[PDB]
Amino acid sequence: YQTFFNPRTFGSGEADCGLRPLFEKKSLEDKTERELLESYI
């Protein structure tokens, strides 16, 4: 229980959040994510 939400009530998932099994986890990029990252000046 070092996460912001208590897993007892939140359930599982917080620690590995936001890393997509088919993209980030495989070092693969989607077709338009560059457009987002390039906008972050």
Binding site: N6, E14, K31, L36
Partner: protein
């Protein structure tokens, strides 16, 4: 979604679709934030002017879908809802301030290559990424309508421009995003995308964060206006209070 492109399989694994049980109809988008909690817009569940006031047993959600019309065997999952919680200060008669709701799944969903939660922003992420010009992403089906999930990337708008684009009284709990009415581009979220997530990818840790919740829309035309989004980071402590008790 209007003027978007085909999303790729597994590209938005936190996307959740909310349906009316009977008669069966797609109502709104939503997002998976854990194996048992889903975030959406309050107006997807409660909007008295249209006689909308759903209870847990009136709805269901489908998770892990890509095709709107094809049933994806052993991929998509369906879940009933145990409880719905709408923000007590949600202002439906005026400006839709605090337009946010949480839904607890009757049973946790199993994560897979197609189902995975999105992150909620921490302070540094919100301060760093929620800036005019920076783009976020919205996903949903096309609307004749669509075959597969569509995606659009939209830039956050300066607050003075948002404020002058509408007669409603905006609050700091919402932000607006979209391209200028000219046509530098003009993809956008639509009515059917209400409740879905507006996500941004942190260049710092490679993770996707849900910065907003698609607010009100009617059709796919805003008559020169910008779509609004509920500011998730500002409502983070409310989300925690509901979950830590629910």
């Amino acid at each position: 979604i209007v003027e978007g492109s085909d999303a790729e399989i597994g590209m938005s694994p936190w996307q959740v679709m909310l349906f009316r049980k009977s008669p069966q109809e797609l109502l709104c988008g939503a997002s998976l934030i854990s194996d048992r909690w889903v975030l959406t817009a309050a107006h997807c569940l409660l909007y008295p002017p249209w006689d909308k006031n759903f209870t847990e047993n009136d709805l269901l959600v489908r998770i892990g879908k890509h095709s709107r019309t094809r049933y994806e065997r052993n991929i998509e999952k369906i879940s009933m809802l145990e409880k719905i919680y709408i923000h007590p200060r949600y202002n439906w008669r005026e400006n839709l301030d605090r337009n946010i709701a949480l839904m607890k799944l009757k049973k946790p969903v199993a994560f897979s290559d197609y189902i995975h939660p999105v992150c909620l922003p921490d302070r540094e992420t919100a301060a760093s990424l929620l800036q005019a010009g920076y783009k976020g992403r919205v996903t949903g089906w096309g609307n004749g309508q669509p075959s597969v999930l569509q995606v659009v990337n939209l830039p956050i708008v300066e607050r003075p421009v948002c404020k002058d684009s509408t007669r409603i009284r905006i609050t700091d709990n919402m932000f607006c995003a979209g391209y200028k009415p000219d046509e530098g581009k003009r993809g956008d979220a639509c009515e059917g995308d209400s409740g879905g997530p507006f996500v941004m990818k942190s260049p710092f840790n490679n993770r996707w964060y849900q910065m907003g919740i698609v607010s009100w829309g009617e059709g796919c035309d805003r008559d020169g206006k910008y779509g609004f989004y509920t500011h998730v980071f500002r409502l983070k402590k409310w989300i925690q209070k509901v979950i830590d008790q629910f």
